[model samples]
Target chain A: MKKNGYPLDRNGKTTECSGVNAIAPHYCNSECTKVYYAESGYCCWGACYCFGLEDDKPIGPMKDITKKYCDVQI
Target chain B: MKKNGYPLDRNGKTTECSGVNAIAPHYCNSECTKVYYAESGYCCWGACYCFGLEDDKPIGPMKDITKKYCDVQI
Candidate 1:
């Protein structure tokens, strides 16, 4: 629902996620809680840095998320 | 010497080099004749491309030139 193409509060108008309150919906915070990419997109437990450039184009961080975008921790 | 910290033409006010007419001094004309970084910093023989970024800083091409900066072919 914002920039960088990702999912935001999706549980209800009230918003939910997988944060401190693991069971229900919440927000993601701290690099510790950051989503890790995997064969399935959301399957890691660390931070990754992307870098590089081509044909004058900048290459930024990238990931495979089959589900949706990560949400900001609340 | 110009931008990026490298010595420019320094033969004479008339500008001499080790390009075409290998005996005297001319200029580089093609990637084929492009300078190559070697054990002597002037031993390669082809075109090269540079890329990358870091800490929000761009990582550009790098090389070892014992002599100075390459000049634009005239």
Candidate 2:
């Protein structure tokens, strides 16, 4: 699954979720779904963490059923 | 804690949380604090509820130990 969002920098690619999808998961191209949490960062396909700080922690989305290391989704 | 938020239409005064402080409790004066939720409404101190639907259910924040009837806090 790929990401969807414009940048904040001069490169024109940022992923800052402005709390638009708090109650529901934001749809990214139908195939990729993301659950954004304010406490932590966001999670994709229930796996893979693209944290605000610690970026780039890849894992097989289909494999990582339990998001032990990612943001805790309710 | 007393209710806070801008009005939606006429008469004035409406409570609509925009999901800013998701992790930390939203401060409503020093004596009052609210925890806003995504799936559920907010809770006060620890008691009472001002849900999106049920608009009035007052309870002492110092009394309610378990939020069984109200929104569950994590």
Candidate 3:
């Protein structure tokens, strides 16, 4: 990791994007500029490889997990 | 871990959910059935605490990572 904090972006912000490790591509959409972007994870709003369990598990609540969800909510 | 993979649902599917671990809340909304939901992580489409470096950093890209995003995009 670069030690010195000198990489000023066009917006005058710094970045710590890591190299070498395979990472998910980060994109932005119209919803990004909105403050709700982070909480909503609504980046780029188009379509790209994303980290989501809903589709990966794409069925309803996992049958085995239902009990967990039922008694686990807090 | 439960070794028996026989937990069947009404749809007759299997589920693998781990207990004793603090996990994220999973909720569903209308867009979820559209199939695009997974790629977007839309969830309940409401405000909920989530994990995101965007706001954690809150400043844009970290000063440490630029040449990374550059020579690394493939």
- Top candidate (TM-score): 2
Candidate with top DockQ is 2
The better candidate by lDDT, 1 or 2, is 2
**lDDT for position A67 in model 1:** 14
Candidate 1 colliding pairs = A7-A69, A16-A25, A16-A26, A17-A25, A17-A26, A28-A73, B1-B8, B36-B44
Lowest-scoring 10 consecutive residues by lDDT in candidate 3 chain A?
A: A36-45
lDDT of 1: 0.21
Better of 1 and 2 by TM-score: 2
Clashing residue pairs, candidate 2? Answer: A6-A13, A6-A14, A7-A13, A7-A14
Rank candidates, lDDT, best first: 2, 3, 1
Tens-place lDDT per residue, model 2, B11-56, is: 2322333333332223211112233322233323222233232223
Candidate 3 clash pair list: A14-B61, A14-B62, A14-B63, A15-B61, A15-B62, A15-B63, A15-B65, A16-B62, A28-A44, A29-A44
- Listed in order, the DockQ scores are 0.01, 0.04, 0.03
Candidate 3, A16-41: lDDT as tens digits? 33221112223321111132122112
